[PDB]
Write a protein that binds this ligand. Structure first.
Ligand SMILES: NCC(=O)N(CCc1ccc(S(N)(=O)=O)cc1)Cc1ccco1
Ligand SMILES: [Zn+2]
Length: 257
């Protein structure tokens, strides 16, 4: 029922998911002058060399690449995190125009899109258990700006015509998510939530400061996807982002000076 339109979009979600008005909701605006450098944070450890992608799919709110998370292959550790978090999937949020599309903002600036690499804390055994814990998930967020192409994204872009509508999926093996990462792992971190229903407050957010550049042709392909399933009125999958939510009693920490 929920979506991103006038009658079912983010301002309506609280009726079915009252935690939408909770104390640690995401995304947020990152005020760069108020985020404090935390010298106690450790460097992130992004260990993706053994990642095993499985499928790419249109779920009616984004498109997602899924990974085999039945053992410790692709893992996120360090930074603000305690323990080992396994990569489950990545997906994107994007706009109808290059100025909008990210969920997090930086000094109120919106990027054209935002990549979310979703990981779960192995101490909880499965993702369903992890989403019920305040430290169950860690999402690595990466901003996309429009400029030069990202070569490591092209394999994704070229397969989107095969998953145009909700429900569609395709084999998507041997995709290397390291090709989506910027040079720097400098980041901001804060405790938050899933940005789509059920909006569970189970996420340690790690948002990289350095955006990746993608080309206009690449993001234009994102915007040809459909929210609807095959054989329904065509509603372009654009502006599938939740706006910034109140920071409330939280501090955003920076890994860098
Ligand atoms: N298998 C369950 C599952 O994965 N869900 C979606 C997970 C989800 C992951 C990441 C983000 S995001 N955009 O914050 O990165 C938003 C939602 C549904 C759910 C959550 C809790 C219970 O059910
Ligand atoms: Zn997301």
């Amino acid at each position: 029922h929920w979506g991103y339109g006038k009658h079912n979009g983010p301002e309506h979600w609280h009726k079915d998911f009252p935690i939408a008005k909770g104390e640690r909701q995401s995304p947020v605006d990152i005020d760069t002058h108020t985020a404090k450098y935390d010298p106690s944070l450790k460097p992130l450890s992004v260990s993706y060399d053994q990642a095993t992608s499985l499928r790419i799919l249109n779920n009616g709110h984004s498109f997602q690449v899924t990974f085999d998370d039945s053992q410790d292959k692709a893992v996120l550790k360090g930074g603000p995190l305690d323990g080992t978090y396994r990569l489950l999937q990545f997906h994107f949020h994007w706009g109808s125009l290059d100025g909008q599309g990210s969920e997090h903002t930086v000094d109120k600036k919106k990027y054209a899109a935002e990549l979310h690499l979703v990981h779960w804390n192995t101490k909880y055994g499965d993702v369903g258990k992890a989403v019920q814990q305040p430290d169950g998930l860690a999402v690595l967020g990466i901003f996309l700006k429009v400029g030069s192409a990202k070569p490591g994204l092209q394999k994704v872009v070229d397969v989107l015509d095969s998953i145009k509508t909700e429900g569609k999926s395709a084999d998507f093996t041997n995709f290397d998510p390291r090709g989506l990462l910027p040079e720097s792992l400098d980041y901001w971190t804060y405790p938050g939530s899933l940005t789509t229903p059920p909006l569970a407050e189970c996420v340690t957010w790690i948002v990289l400061k350095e955006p990746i550049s993608v080309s206009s042709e690449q993001v234009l392909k994102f915007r040809k996807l459909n929210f609807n399933g095959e054989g329904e009125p065509e509603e372009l999958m654009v502006d599938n982002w939740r706006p910034a939510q109140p920071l409330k009693n939280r501090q955003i920490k920076a890994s860098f000076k």
